[PDB]
Write an enzyme that holds these catalytic residues in place. Structure first.
Site, PDB file in Angstrom:
ATOM      1  N   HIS A  62     109.166  58.440  59.212  1.00 42.00           N
ATOM      2  CA  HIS A  62     108.685  57.996  60.231  1.00 42.00           C
ATOM      3  C   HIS A  62     107.009  58.134  60.186  1.00 42.00           C
ATOM      4  O   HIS A  62     106.265  57.366  60.531  1.00 42.00           O
ATOM      5  CB  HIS A  62     109.026  58.188  61.645  1.00 42.00           C
ATOM      6  CG  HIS A  62     110.756  57.935  61.851  1.00 42.00           C
ATOM      7  ND1 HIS A  62     111.263  56.665  61.358  1.00 42.00           N
ATOM      8  CD2 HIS A  62     111.395  58.887  62.214  1.00 42.00           C
ATOM      9  CE1 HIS A  62     112.337  57.016  61.485  1.00 42.00           C
ATOM     10  NE2 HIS A  62     112.621  58.286  62.072  1.00 42.00           N
ATOM     11  N   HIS A  92     101.827  64.809  65.017  1.00 39.87           N
ATOM     12  CA  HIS A  92     102.180  63.810  64.168  1.00 39.87           C
ATOM     13  C   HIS A  92     100.890  62.908  64.175  1.00 39.87           C
ATOM     14  O   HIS A  92     100.202  62.957  65.309  1.00 39.87           O
ATOM     15  CB  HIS A  92     103.442  63.079  64.086  1.00 39.87           C
ATOM     16  CG  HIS A  92     103.602  62.407  65.253  1.00 39.87           C
ATOM     17  ND1 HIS A  92     104.347  62.919  66.511  1.00 39.87           N
ATOM     18  CD2 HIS A  92     103.285  61.195  65.649  1.00 39.87           C
ATOM     19  CE1 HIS A  92     104.379  62.207  67.475  1.00 39.87           C
ATOM     20  NE2 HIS A  92     103.933  61.133  66.832  1.00 39.87           N
ATOM     21  N   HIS A  94      99.926  58.618  63.525  1.00 37.12           N
ATOM     22  CA  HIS A  94     100.095  56.982  63.340  1.00 37.12           C
ATOM     23  C   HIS A  94      98.894  56.534  62.691  1.00 37.12           C
ATOM     24  O   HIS A  94      97.972  56.624  63.144  1.00 37.12           O
ATOM     25  CB  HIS A  94     100.264  56.249  64.580  1.00 37.12           C
ATOM     26  CG  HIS A  94     101.577  56.809  65.464  1.00 37.12           C
ATOM     27  ND1 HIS A  94     102.898  56.399  65.402  1.00 37.12           N
ATOM     28  CD2 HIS A  94     101.589  57.836  66.313  1.00 37.12           C
ATOM     29  CE1 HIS A  94     103.669  57.094  66.228  1.00 37.12           C
ATOM     30  NE2 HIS A  94     102.874  57.956  66.768  1.00 37.12           N
ATOM     31  N   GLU A 104      97.843  53.515  68.193  1.00 32.11           N
ATOM     32  CA  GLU A 104      98.768  52.914  69.147  1.00 32.11           C
ATOM     33  C   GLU A 104      97.985  52.449  70.632  1.00 32.11           C
ATOM     34  O   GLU A 104      98.290  51.279  70.867  1.00 32.11           O
ATOM     35  CB  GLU A 104      99.849  53.977  69.453  1.00 32.11           C
ATOM     36  CG  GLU A 104     101.197  53.725  69.495  1.00 32.11           C
ATOM     37  CD  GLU A 104     102.246  54.526  68.516  1.00 32.11           C
ATOM     38  OE1 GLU A 104     102.371  55.842  69.060  1.00 32.11           O
ATOM     39  OE2 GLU A 104     102.878  54.202  67.719  1.00 32.11           O
ATOM     40  N   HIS A 117      99.194  62.598  67.964  1.00 30.15           N
ATOM     41  CA  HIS A 117      99.741  62.963  69.025  1.00 30.15           C
ATOM     42  C   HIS A 117     100.264  64.424  68.855  1.00 30.15           C
ATOM     43  O   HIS A 117     100.862  64.649  68.299  1.00 30.15           O
ATOM     44  CB  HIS A 117     101.168  61.875  69.196  1.00 30.15           C
ATOM     45  CG  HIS A 117     100.747  60.748  69.452  1.00 30.15           C
ATOM     46  ND1 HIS A 117     101.596  59.483  69.514  1.00 30.15           N
ATOM     47  CD2 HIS A 117      99.624  60.194  70.043  1.00 30.15           C
ATOM     48  CE1 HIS A 117     101.084  58.371  69.685  1.00 30.15           C
ATOM     49  NE2 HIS A 117      99.806  58.638  69.941  1.00 30.15           N
ATOM     50  N   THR A 196     106.953  56.477  71.947  1.00 28.81           N
ATOM     51  CA  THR A 196     106.604  55.151  71.335  1.00 28.81           C
ATOM     52  C   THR A 196     107.134  54.887  70.128  1.00 28.81           C
ATOM     53  O   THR A 196     107.127  54.037  69.561  1.00 28.81           O
ATOM     54  CB  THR A 196     104.879  55.278  70.707  1.00 28.81           C
ATOM     55  OG1 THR A 196     104.767  56.075  69.524  1.00 28.81           O
ATOM     56  CG2 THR A 196     104.037  55.552  71.765  1.00 28.81           C
ATOM     57  N   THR A 197     108.358  55.748  69.971  1.00 30.17           N
ATOM     58  CA  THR A 197     109.515  55.639  68.905  1.00 30.17           C
ATOM     59  C   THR A 197     110.588  55.811  69.658  1.00 30.17           C
ATOM     60  O   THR A 197     110.835  56.267  70.574  1.00 30.17           O
ATOM     61  CB  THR A 197     109.397  56.577  67.781  1.00 30.17           C
ATOM     62  OG1 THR A 197     109.717  57.722  68.213  1.00 30.17           O
ATOM     63  CG2 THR A 197     107.852  56.509  67.061  1.00 30.17           C
TER      64      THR A 197
END
Ligand SMILES: N#Cc1ccc(N(Cc2ccc(OS(N)(=O)=O)c(Br)c2)n2cnnc2)cc1
Ligand SMILES: [Zn+2]
Ligand SMILES: [Zn+2]
Length: 258
Positions: A62, A92, A94, A104, A117, A196-197
């Protein structure tokens, strides 16, 4: 067959397996500076990362994540809109397929190259597993990445990515100091949201910093060399692993700065 970020299993499809995707406090959201409300009652953020103990970095299909030892009351986040202490467990990122997108959260509809994040859980719940089941269980510190000068404290992360290219790959990652990823100012926006996942649980108090950190084009480019797939399977580059902004609904975004 499983959620992901593709055209047939991406964000637009998540609600079928996780109905909460269409919930009342979903994240991310667009931060409208025309409507954000300054709140003088918001306290300064208290970040105590000196005792942070990184363990390893891994590609879980991911994104890539750096895990910390949250056993002791080591690295903790407190203050701001939070009551109590929150322990750092991992961080992590994005990012996108091009520098023009990847974050995001957005500010006045503007997208950044990536978003960092830092995930923390409320110690009053004993562990991360029990914390995610509570409305005030988690606190995620979000930091935007803009392309410009290089961020020295990020180089160690970038250089090790070559060794965890495929899903399932891990590498020891000790002695990494997360303080090297923070911007100068800690002014922030805050609102109640969700992961958000998937599972998309609405257990997060979001703290998004106003000041982005600058990273070089060379550094972000390395993020795009990772793969979603495992070693041996068809090659599918890990890019655009971000969820689009969700409806604000009956929520108010507060600012810690005038
Ligand atoms: N079921 C289940 C489940 C899913 C993910 C995790 N995360 C990683 C993780 C991933 C995304 C996430 O939400 S986000 N994007 O930070 O808003 C948060 Br918040 C935490 N995780 C792994 N180790 N500590 C936390 C844990 C349980
Ligand atoms: Zn205005
Ligand atoms: Zn995230």
């Amino acid at each position: 067959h499983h959620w992901g970020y593709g055209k047939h299993n991406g964000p637009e499809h998540w609600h079928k397996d996780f109905p909460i995707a269409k919930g009342e406090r979903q994240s991310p959201v667009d931060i409208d500076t025309h409507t954000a409300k300054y709140d003088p009652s918001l306290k300064p953020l208290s970040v105590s990362y000196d005792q942070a103990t990184s363990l390893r970095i891994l590609n879980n299909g991911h994104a890539f994540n750096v895990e910390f030892d949250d056993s002791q009351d080591k690295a903790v986040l407190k203050g701001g809109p939070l009551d109590g202490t929150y322990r750092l467990i991992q961080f992590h990122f994005h990012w996108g397929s091009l520098d023009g997108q990847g974050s995001e959260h957005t500010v006045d509809k503007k997208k950044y190259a990536a978003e960092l994040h830092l995930v923390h859980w409320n110690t009053k719940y004993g562990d991360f597993g029990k914390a995610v089941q509570q409305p005030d269980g988690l606190a995620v510190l979000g930091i935007f990445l803009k392309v410009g000068s290089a961020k020295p404290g990020l180089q160690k992360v970038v250089d090790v990515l070559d060794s965890i290219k495929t899903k399932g790959k891990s590498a020891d990652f000790t002695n990494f100091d997360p303080r090297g990823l923070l911007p100068e100012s800690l002014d922030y926006w805050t609102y109640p949201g969700s992961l958000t996942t998937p599972p998309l649980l609405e257990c997060v108090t979001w703290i998004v910093l106003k000041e982005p950190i600058s990273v070089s084009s060379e550094q972000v480019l390395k993020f795009r060399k990772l793969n979603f797939n495992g070693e041996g399977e068809p090659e599918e580059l890990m890019v655009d692993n971000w969820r689009p902004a969700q409806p604000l609904k009956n929520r108010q975004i507060k600012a810690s700065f005038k």
